[PDB]
């Protein structure tokens, strides 16, 4: 958000936000799908890797390109710059690619069901299927996995180049005024380290937060539309939306409760680092002078460091117990809710696997948020360091 | 392997190895199991968590205690010490606990079969099953998981205390000779850091290597005895031990190729480090002088660091491609070997799952060793540093 890269620190981000909101609530809720009525959009979506060319996707590609083009051209004409190409279009492209990868994941999860239904048919009645059908299924799976691989690799390449461009832009800006910044202590290590640290950390946090929100908004409606086959839960009885509540409560309770029960550790780590540093400094003074380090004082300092380690070694047990117990029960909790439905003859082998996979992905989407917060505090420290060290 | 903790780096270790060899080739190949003939050993093993009190395990516990007792007491009498109790018995206990946890894993993998046979019967013919059987199966699984959790937590606690005792022992030994070691440059950082680094690194690599070998030696016979139901492979045809050969080849190829295709990276990391250090040093010189920092020289330094990062960014794509491709193919490869047998109706759902899980665990037992190597490199650097800095 500096002045050199990213055309302005003010109106730019606000304008981007407002225009994003206008576009989103013109498409989804306002019903832009009427555009699909002008074209011949059928509305049915295949399962193969031919999904990504049907008009229902191609209209969306056109809409995204049109919106981003208009927005970027406005700024290109209103207030020129030097890194406009990277700062606008690289960010738009990274957002798009994250969405695309989420969609590929959705496609594979949708593929799991026919395969296992076919396996069940094969096992129950040995005269009904041959091997060519299994070969066909493997073929379509490879068809999807290919594009997943290609997009992932190219995305990594482009992200790395973009981050280095941010670093070079603001290093150039700082060195443009080196003479007035000579005297302030720690200018060298600042200019050499904090620039890369800030750029990389902020990019990583932004991408992870966006991806978490996208995964949730893509995968909860599948749980809603699949919760029609599980009317009764083993202990509760009858709830309209038992599956959704159970998944949310289980994943939330796991991640949030483990985060809360292990909140007190970092302070203990501060204490350990401080006492060790005191030991080191006292030894450094003792190195050259023959009256500094005497067995009394070194004994006292080592007693302090030992006593401050044992506290951490004892508090770690709550966290260990909670983590291991949750990890062990998770292997069968997702399967525990589906006994009455299997007996009652509603879900086949192939709607067990989709349900397990969706549980897993919704659980994993509640993990990026605590990564985002953990990265955010780190980013705050460096932000204040780069702000104070500027006049 | 110092002189303070672990009495000697010579005869002690060699004696330990020789006694281990005698004990092992008296038990396995020489058949000490005839003690089971003296006692009323059943010879059969349950499936529940009631396994770990059966005579077959209790005899082994007695034998291990007796062997360790003889070995330890000979050294207690022959050549006394100060930390003998930790140095002998802590290591013996850590080895035993690692083996125990491997056995717990084997028990769970064996439990996976009856459960999925029951689920298949519930899906096919629902008049043969009732829900109480599902509840009983979940009960026995919890019965195993409980002891797994308890042993794991206690083991982590003991390992941490053992490492800290090693550190305090050699710290005390060094500080006994502080007066004569003052002049050697960089003594404070040595005494304050290398002790913890060396102890922790060596212990971690030893534990991981032992655990990998134990997993292989426990999980290969299961594949040998389970490959009797899979006579024909999809392309090869008929081969006496097709499953074992295919599993070994796939896992070894995966891990070894991923390792070899990416051997060049650390050198590039070092080059980047050195160029950045040069840039930092030049800026530090030019800070308080009005001539050292000049646009041409700093421009040259930055050009070097840019041109040298771009090479790593270009090379890393091959590693990305290999990694992602293997990670995506492994999803369905494990099930690709079982198509003719599923079709012909030989294996039931419940031996598909055992086989898949065994594939996963043998693949995960080829990943410890590659980490052991990387830990060994770090160990050796610190070893040479701490051996040069002793007269």
């Amino acid at each position: 958000m500096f002045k050199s890269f990213f055309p302005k620190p003010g109106t730019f981000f606000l304008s981007a936000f407002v225009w994003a909101l206008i576009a989103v609530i013109f498409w989804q809720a306002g019903g832009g799908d009427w555009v699909a009525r002008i074209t011949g959009a059928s509305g049915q979506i295949p399962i193969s890797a031919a999904r990504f060319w049907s008009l229902d996707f191609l209209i969306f590609y056109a809409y995204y390109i049109v919106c981003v083009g208009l927005f970027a051209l406005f700024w290109f004409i209103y207030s020129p710059h030097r890194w406009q190409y990277w700062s606008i279009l690289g960010t738009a492209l990274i957002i798009f690619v994250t969405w695309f990868l989420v969609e590929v994941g959705v496609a594979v999860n949708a593929w799991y069901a026919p395969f296992y239904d076919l396996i069940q048919t094969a096992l129950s009645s040995p005269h009904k299927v041959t091997i060519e059908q299994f070969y066909r299924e493997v073929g379509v799976f490879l068809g999807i996995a290919l594009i997943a691989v290609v997009i992932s690799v190219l995305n990594n390449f482009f992200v790395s180049h973009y981050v280095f461009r941010w670093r070079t832009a603001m290093n150039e800006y700082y060195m443009a005024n080196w003479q007035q910044l000579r005297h302030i202590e720690g200018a060298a290590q600042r200019v050499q380290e904090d620039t890369m640290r800030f750029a990389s950390t902020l990019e990583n946090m932004g991408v992870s937060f966006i991806n978490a929100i996208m995964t949730l908004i893509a995968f909860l409606p599948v749980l809603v539309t699949l919760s029609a086959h599980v009317p009764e839960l083993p202990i509760i009885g009858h709830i309209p939306y038992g599956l959704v509540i159970a998944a949310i409560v289980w994943s939330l309770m796991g991640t949030g409760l483990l985060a809360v029960v292990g909140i007190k550790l970092p302070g203990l780590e501060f204490k350990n680092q401080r006492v060790e540093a005191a030991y080191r400094k006292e030894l450094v003074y003792g190195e050259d002078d023959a009256t500094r380090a005497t067995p009394p004082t070194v004994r006292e300092l080592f007693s302090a460091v030992r006593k401050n380690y044992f506290r951490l070694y004892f508090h770690y047990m709550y966290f260990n117990i909670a983590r291991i117990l949750y990890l062990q029960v998770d292997n069968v909790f997702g399967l525990f809710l589906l006994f009455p439905s299997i007996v009652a003859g509603t879900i086949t082998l192939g709607l067990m696997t989709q349900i397990t996979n969706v549980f897993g992905q919704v659980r994993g989407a509640f993990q990026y948020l605590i990564n985002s917060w953990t990265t955010l505090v780190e980013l705050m420290s460096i932000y204040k360091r780069l702000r104070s060290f500027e006049h | 392997m110092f002189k303070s903790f672990f009495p000697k780096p010579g005869t002690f270790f060699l004696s330990a190895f020789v006694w281990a060899l005698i004990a092992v080739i008296f038990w396995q190949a020489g058949g000490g199991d005839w003690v089971a003939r003296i006692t009323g050993a059943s010879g059969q093993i349950p499936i529940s968590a009631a396994r770990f009190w059966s005579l077959d395990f209790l005899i082994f516990y007695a034998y291990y205690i007796v062997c360790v007792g003889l070995f330890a007491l000979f050294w207690f009498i022959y050549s006394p010490h100060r930390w003998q109790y930790w140095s002998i018995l802590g290591t013996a206990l850590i080895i035993f606990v690692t083996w125990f946890l491997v056995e717990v894993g084997v028990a769970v993998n064996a439990w996976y079969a009856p459960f999925y046979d029951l689920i298949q019967t519930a899906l096919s013919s629902p008049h043969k099953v009732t829900i109480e059987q599902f509840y009983r199966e979940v009960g026995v699984f919890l019965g195993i998981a409980l002891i797994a959790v308890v042993i794991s937590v206690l083991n982590n606690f003991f390992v941490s205390h053992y490492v800290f005792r090693w550190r305090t022992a050699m710290n005390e030994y060094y500080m006994a000779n502080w007066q004569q070691l003052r002049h050697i440059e960089g003594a404070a950082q040595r005494v304050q850091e290398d002790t913890m680094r060396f102890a922790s690194t060596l212990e971690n690599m030893g534990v991981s290597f032992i655990n990998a070998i134990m997993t292989l030696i426990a999980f290969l016979p299961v594949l040998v005895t389970l490959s009797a139901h899979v006579p024909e492979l999809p392309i090869i045809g008929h081969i006496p031990y097709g499953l074992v050969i295919a599993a070994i080849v796939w896992s070894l190829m995966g891990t070894g190729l991923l390792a070899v295709v990416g051997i060049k990276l650390p050198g590039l990391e070092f080059k980047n480090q050195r160029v950045e250090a040069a840039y930092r040093k030049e800026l530090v010189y030019g800070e308080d002088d009005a001539t050292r920092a000049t646009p041409p020289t700093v421009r040259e330094l930055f050009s070097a660091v840019r041109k040298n990062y771009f090479r790593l960014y270009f090379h890393y794509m091959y590693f990305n491609i290999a990694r992602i491709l293997y990670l995506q193919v492994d999803n369905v490869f494990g099930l690709f070997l079982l198509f003719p047998s599923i079709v012909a109706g030989t294996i039931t759902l419940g031996l598909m799952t055992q086989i898949t899980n065994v594939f996963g665990q043998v693949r995960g037992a080829f990943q410890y060793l590659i980490n052991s190597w990387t830990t060994l490199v770090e160990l050796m650097s610190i070893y040479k540093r701490l051996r040069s800095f002793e007269h």
Partner: antibody
Amino acid sequence: LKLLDSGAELVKPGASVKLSCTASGFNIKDTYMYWVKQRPDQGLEWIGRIDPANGNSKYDPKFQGKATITADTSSNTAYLQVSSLTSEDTAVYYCARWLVRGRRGTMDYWGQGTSVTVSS
Amino acid sequence: DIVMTQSPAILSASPGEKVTMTCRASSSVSYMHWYQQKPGSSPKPWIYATSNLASGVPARFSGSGSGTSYSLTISRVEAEDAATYYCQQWSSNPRTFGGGTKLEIKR
């Protein structure tokens, strides 16, 4: 419980015929509904069954391709169709219900039978 | 197919005596049920899973056996037990009946 079958039927060699069995007093989502055939030699022969909740049906291999069993989950009813009738298909056909989920009471209840006379 | 043989194929008794019939399988089942068909009427279970007497039937019927050997026992026959008895196995997806043992009453 009650099961009502159709009436007696007379057919010409070559025609196909459909028989119905309607269930009043319970919910056919909780049971099986199989069909049994008894020739004039009183020995009993098993034809096939169906699971109305999802639709899986199973047949004796000898009768495969000769009979088709279906269920109407909306209004309690089950149907069986016989094709290519010959002179060896004169018998009596009984429907039945077997409790799988909801187990209490008598676990097997039989209908009454519909004679199917094939003649010219 | 699991072929099931029932003996004796024709029987007799008198009011007050005890009667047994045997229905021997051809492999392990664990799933045996016993029926009765009077003249001109549909069948009716007595014994479900070889021991569990179903809803109210006179307490003089009793079944026993396990593995591949099963017996039906009637304690004190009456004039109202002249019928034909079958035995059904259940543990496959062909299901095979028995041969039936016409019972008579002496007088």
